Amino acid sequence: EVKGKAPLELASGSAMVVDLQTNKVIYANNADEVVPIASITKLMTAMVVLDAKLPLDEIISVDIHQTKEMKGVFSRVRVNSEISRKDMLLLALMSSENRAAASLAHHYPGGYNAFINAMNAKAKSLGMTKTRYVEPTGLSINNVSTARDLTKLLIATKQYPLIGQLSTTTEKMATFREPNYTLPFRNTNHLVYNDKWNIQLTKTGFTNQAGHCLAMRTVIGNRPVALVVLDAFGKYTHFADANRLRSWMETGKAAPIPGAAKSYRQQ
Template sequence: MPNFEFLYLAWPLMLAVPFAPQAVAKTAAATTASQPEIASGSAMIVDLNTNKVIYSNHPDLVRPIASISKLMTAMVVLDARLPLDEKLKVDISQTPEMKGVYSRVRLNSEISRKDMLLLALMSSENRAAASLAHHYPGGYKAFIKAMNAKAKSLGMNNTRFVEPTGLSVHNVSTARDLTKLLIASKQYPLIGQLSTTREDMATFSNPTYTLPFRNTNHLVYRDNWNIQLTKTGFTNAAGHCLVMRTVINNKPVALVVMDAFGKYTHFADASRLRTWIETGKVMPVPQQR
């Protein structure tokens, strides 16, 4: 069964404890160095005022991106200028990657296109993302074609999409390409609004039922982060991924962290990178025993 982001994470605990304790050896105190330490496979930070690279680590390594794909899904939907209040039927019939994937959202029930976007971006709901593609002018295949055309137009030369959710290992990109996606996302304020929503209730029809949803990025619950847009992603192949448009050291930045092994490593690496930019101090990466 594919692995994906679960909607119900132990977020209250994570608010109290930023990153779950792992089996680690004693760590040294923070030091000052020219480059920070991170545990993720690749990363990149770009100053959005100048588009200059602040930090990079293996930025051109091509990797699966899991649910980061849903940012492109949202862009393609909004580019089509479809009515956001239109009720859409939950449909995954043309997304074979969805077979056997658990969801609380019932097939064939209905909800507005805007709420589909909210669930896909905030809670990484796979059935919502797949349904958006199924209700695209020209159909599902046209949607995937539009995703790749959009990537090409943004200069994302090492990026490829085969489906809208990110469950496929063939949805791939690089940290550098994803910063380009984040730069382009400035033109989509609704994506920023929906992706940073902390929690919401979604009401479906045919049949009528209501479900609670929460954000998969625990950093949006923290008042010391100013996040304008975000998306998380996870599959076994992709590891844990995180992209954000945020503010660090009073500057707007695009931050990408990919291929993190630990469940909270991508959040910890984002904090380590922020500390390094703001103070010059390197926060050590805990070593597993």
């Protein structure tokens, strides 16, 4: 086992992997490039809700009128219908449900604008100096961060067990009222159904401008790690990069990335 690990090369534009028991960087590539993070915004939305210590069992209404980016966006979640704050957090984290994420910011002491301000105040308190939030869903391309800043956010999520628990929920039959209707929801990360993965927290995002993004807390062997991959050009490049990091940390062997991925990065 003296051989050692061969050079690791991911296909994603930016990436960072950190040991959560020492906060030491395992891998870093262009980790300071500002990029749109889309639905990874919902991790901050959940943190802001949990910091307010609002009752999770409270039944709240679907309200999205202050989120301009939600205008005209399709959702199976009906406006004015109601479900627990905990269920709205679950839908936002497991399924990236945009109306659920927006509704959480419309049921916050101090109002919607205060919620957005609290998102930015939390980023500042965590040293996320290149991060900016303008709305709670991630639909805005102006929700930006870096692989390093999202690593700081993943480290902070350790202090909020419910974020990781709801984000790794495999499926959920959600029951709403006003009026009554039930919706089936599944996790956006197929890796949660793979028994070869040990995931504590997972969140994905996608924009046409930067492509696929993935932030996860996972146990690889006997090492809890934070994994952030951003600007993944190819459709499953983010999941493939996670599998590359995992297989590499287990065997020390790295898989050569495809030409199309190699091209995008080199450009």
